[PDB]
Structure formats: C-alpha cells, structure tokens
Design a protein around this ligand. Structure first.
Ligand SMILES: COc1nc(N)nc2c1ncn2[C@H]1C[C@H](O)[C@@H](COP(=O)(O)O)O1
Length: 157
C-alpha cells in the first residue's frame, strides 16, 4: 500500500467474557462504537500514543498493550492512507469513565453491536476474538461503503 500514511492507534480492552467499546461523541466516526485511539503525535511512540489515547478517552491506564493487528484505510479522494495500529489488553487499571470524545460500555462477546460500528469491524473482529494477529486493508467511499478490502492472518504484526 504505497503512499504517505498517517499513524493512528486503536485499543481493544478484551477480557474473557467481555470487550470495552466507546461510543464516539464528536468528530470522526461520531455515532459509532469503536476501540479507543487517535493520531500518533510527534515525540511519542505508537504504543505511547495508544496508551495516551486510552487514558484521554476512558481514563484507564494499562500495564501491557499487545500488538494484534494493522489496518490500512483508503478514503476515496483523501491523499493520506490511515495506518491504524491495533492493540489489545486484558488487564486494565481504573474504572472506565466518559470523556468529551467517548462514552464507554462493556459488551458481552456475543452482543457486539456491529450494526452501530464501522463496517470493517465485522471482518476483522472475529480474528481479534480468536486471538489471531492480522493485516487488513479497506477502501471506503464515504463512511458507509467498502469498495475493496483484503484481510489475512500474520505471525508478526
Ligand atoms: C474506516 O474504518 C475504521 N474502522 C475502525 N474500527 N476504526 C477506525 C476506522 N477509521 C479510523 N478508525 C479509528 C482510528 C482511531 O482510533 C480513530 C480516529 O481518530 P480520532 O479522529 O477519533 O481521533 O478511529
């Protein structure tokens, strides 16, 4: 996937029988449940950015984040690809609380609200839930339509 890309993070708190999602309240993807995350800033590592965004959006801190995936997004007409680094943790510190950006809620693993999530999630979530590492690519036309996609399992994220 050639071209300048912009680094983002996505963090899924995934425990044995539940997963934490945030309802995005403003900005990009508002009105959909997602993992926690954002742009990676100058002067922080990708993992530092993931932690930062988890704290900003949910108040939670974490001992260890694990790399579980990479998803590259093309938005038709937008020059930069989005290079999203996906992370998982089971253990968390604190109780999740609402932020300006996100309203947190736990979901049982058989009640994941896919119809109110970004449409790409239904493709790669099953791999996340199976503990399989993956590389994904999705080309979107606007916010609702996937024109192209690829998805595979990887041994190294
Ligand atoms: C298009 O399909 C997509 N599907 C999913 N599941 N997540 C996506 C996504 N596009 C972007 N993100 C994620 C990355 C970031 O966590 C956040 C954006 O950063 P903020 O604008 O909220 O600061 O949204």
């Amino acid at each position: 996937h050639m071209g300048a890309s912009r680094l983002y993070t996505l963090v899924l708190v995934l425990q044995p029988q539940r997963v934490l999602l945030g309802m995005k309240k403003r900005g990009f993807g508002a009105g959909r449940w997602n993992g926690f995350g954002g742009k990676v800033q100058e002067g922080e590592t990708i993992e530092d950015g993931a932690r930062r965004e988890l704290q900003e959006e949910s108040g939670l801190t974490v001992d260890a984040l694990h790399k579980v995936g990479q998803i590259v997004f093309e938005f038709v007409g937008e020059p930069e690809l989005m290079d999203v680094h996906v992370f998982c943790t089971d253990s968390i510190q604190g109780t999740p609380v609402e932020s300006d950006e996100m309203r947190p809620c736990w979901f049982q693993l058989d009640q994941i609200p896919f119809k109110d999530m970004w449409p790409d999630d239904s493709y790669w979530f099953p791999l996340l839930l199976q503990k399989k590492k993956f590389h994904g690519y999705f080309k979107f036309q606007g916010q609702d339509t996937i024109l192209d996609y690829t998805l595979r399992e990887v041994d190294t994220v």
